[PDB]
Amino acid sequence: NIEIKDTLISEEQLQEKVKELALQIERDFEGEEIVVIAVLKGSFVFAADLIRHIKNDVTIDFISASSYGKVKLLKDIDVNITGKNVIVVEDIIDSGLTLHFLKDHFFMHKPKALKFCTLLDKPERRKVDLTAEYVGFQIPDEFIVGYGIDCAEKYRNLPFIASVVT
Amino acid sequence: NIEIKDTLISEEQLQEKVKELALQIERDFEGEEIVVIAVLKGSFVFAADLIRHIKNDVTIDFISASSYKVKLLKDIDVNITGKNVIVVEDIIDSGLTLHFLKDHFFMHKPKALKFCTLLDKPERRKVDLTAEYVGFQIPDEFIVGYGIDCAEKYRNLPFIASVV
Amino acid sequence: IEIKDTLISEEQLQEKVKELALQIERDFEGEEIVVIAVLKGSFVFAADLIRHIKNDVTIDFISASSYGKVKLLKDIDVNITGKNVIVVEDIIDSGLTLHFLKDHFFMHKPKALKFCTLLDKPERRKVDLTAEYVGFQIPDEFIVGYGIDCAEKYRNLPFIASVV
Amino acid sequence: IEIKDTLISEEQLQEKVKELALQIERDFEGEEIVVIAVLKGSFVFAADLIRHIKNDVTIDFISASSYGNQTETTGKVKLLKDIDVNITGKNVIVVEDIIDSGLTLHFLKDHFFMHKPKALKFCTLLDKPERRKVDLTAEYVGFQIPDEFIVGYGIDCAEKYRNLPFIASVV
C-alpha cells in the first residue's frame, strides 16, 4: 500500500509561489496577450490558480500526449497560437521527453514566444535538454502527490504537496 | 468588442459556495470513493477548487464533447464501473450535452451518477435534466470568469461577471 | 510470426464481398446508406464492399477499444439521425465492443442499424449480437490478412491466412 | 451535384496502383515499410496499394482538421488522430488522395519528421502541382488531373460518391 509520508509544500507556500510566478509572467509579457496551454491532466490545479493571478488578456487551452518506448498526441490544441506568446504549464518536469516533443510541436504553429512553466522541476532527471523558464520548486522526494498530481490516480485532491512511500 | 459589465458572483461568494457543495458531496458519499469527471474546458477551475474541499478518496478525469445528439471528442480513461460518479460542469443551460453524457456514462454501469454544476440557467432547458448539486441559478445572460469564456476570453477572472 | 495456410483466397473474398453487396443493395433498394467502418482492420473489407454497392453511400469511421466498458477513441462526424446505417467489421467474436457501439449509435436515433462482418465467431459471444450480413464463419483462432493483423503485421495480404 | 464523365476507370486505377506498388517495392527492397494513410479519402487507394506490396507492411492512419482561414494560407492543421505505430528509424510512406496546395501535407511532413524516421516519402493518387503554394514533390503519383471537382475511389463531394469504383469529374 502507498501512504503519505511528509508534507513537502503547504497550501500557503503553494499560493505564495503561484503569486510569485504570475507576477513574473505579467512582467515578462507586460502589455501583451498570453496563451496558456495546460498539459493534462496533473497541471490543471496549478493552471487554475496561476491564471487567476495573471491579469493580462489570457486565452487557455489544453494538450494531451502520452510517450512510449517518440510521443503520441491525444488531444491537440484548438486555439490559435500563431504570432502569440505561449506559456505551457506543467505539474512536474523530470525526463523532459514529452515536453520536448510538445515544444517542437508548438513551434510548428509559429508562435511569437514559447515558454515553459512547471510547478516542480527535477532537472537532474533530464533525458533531453529542456529548460523551463518558470519553475515553482525543485523538490528531491521520490514520489510526490497532491495539488493535481497523482499516485496511481489517487491524491490529486490534496491541497498541499506531499511525498508518498510504500 | 466585449466588455465586462458587472460582477455577478464575487470570488468570496464562489469560494463559500464551493465549500458548501463539497460538504454536501462528502456527506452524500461518506466513507466511499468518488470519481469526479470534469466536462472540459470551462469547468476546470470549479473542479480544481471543488476537489480541494472533498476529503474522500477522489479520482479525477475529463471528458470533451460538442454538438453536431452530441459528439464525443475525448472519452474518459478511468474506470467508473461500480463507482460513485460526479460529473462537474460550469453551466447547465439546454442540458443536451449533459443528458447525452448521462446516457453515455450509464453505459459504464457506475454505482451512482450525479451532476454538479456551478451555475444553472433553468429557463434554457431543451430536455429534462436536474443536477443534484447546483451552486447558483442565474439569469439568462452572457457571463464570463472562473473558467468560463466569451470567445476564449476572460476565463482568468477570479469572479463571475456579465459582459456586453 | 510466419504465414501458414491460406484459409480464404483473394478470389473467395471477392466473390463473397459481391454477394454481401447484392444483399445490402436489395435490403435498401432506393435508399441512402451510411457505412461506418470500425478501425483499423475493417478498412480493406469496407473499401471493397462499398465499391459494389450502387446506392448513394456515405462512409465514416469509428475507433473504440476495451478498458479490460468500451472506450470511444474516435466518434463519427456524419449525421446518421434518421438514416440507414451499416456498421462494418472485420471480425465479431465477443460482440462486446460492438454491442456498446450499438447503444451509442442508437443515442443518435438512426432509421436502421445493421451489422456487417467479414468473419463471424458466434461461439465466442459474451453478449447477444447478431450480424445481419456475415461473410464467413471459420474456426481458425489465429488469422491475418485482408486488413486483419497479428501484432500490426500482415494486414496487407490480399488473402486470409493462418499464422504460427 | 452530377457526375460528368469517367476520368479514370476501375481498371486504369488498378494498373497504376500496381505500378506504384512495384516502384515502392524496388525502392525499399528487403525492408519493412510503414504506410500511413491520411483519412478519410485515401483509404480505398491505401487498401488497394498495400495489397500489391510484398514487403512487411505496417499500416496506420492520421487525421487532421483545419483551423479555418489560417490553414488555407499556412497549412497549419490540428491533429485529430495521431499515429499509434512507431516510425522512428522506419521507412515511411504517407498516402494521400490528392495533393493540391500542399500546405497541409507539408505540415504533416514536419510532424512525421519529429519522430525521426529512416525515410519519409509521399504517395498521392492524384496531384495538382500547378496548385502548389509550397514546395512538395510527391515521390509517387498516380495521376495529374486538370483542376476540376472529382469524386470516386474514396474521394468525396460533400461526403458523397466515395464508393464509385472509378474517378469521375462532377459538375
Q: What would you note in describing this structure?
A:
4 copies of one chain form a homotetramer. The first copy, chain A, is α/β, with parallel strands linked by helices and 166 residues long. Chain A has a single domain (1-166), classed as Rossmann fold (3-Layer(aba) Sandwich). Chain A has 3 helices and 9 strands; from the N terminus they run βαβαβββαββββ. Chain A has helices at residues 11-28, 44-51, 97-107, and strands spanning 3-9, 34-39, 58-67, 71-75, 85-93, 113-121, 134-138, 144-145, 161-165. The first copy, chain A, has a 6-stranded mixed beta sheet with strand order 4-3-2-5-6-7. In chain A, β2, α2 (44-51) and β3 form a beta-alpha-beta unit. The longest helix of chain A has 18 residues, at 11-28. The radius of gyration of chain A is 16 Å and the shape is globular. Chains in contact: A-B, A-D, B-C, C-D. The interface between A and B is medium-sized, with 29 and 28 residues. Chain B: InterPro entries: HGPRT, Hxn_phspho_trans, PRTase-like, PRTase_dom. Chain B: Mg(2+) 2 binds at residue 149. Chain B: Pathway: Purine metabolism; IMP biosynthesis via salvage pathway; IMP from hypoxanthine: step 1/1; Purine metabolism; GMP biosynthesis via salvage pathway; GMP from guanine: step 1/1. Chain B: It is found in: Cytoplasm. Chain B: Its main location: cytoplasm.
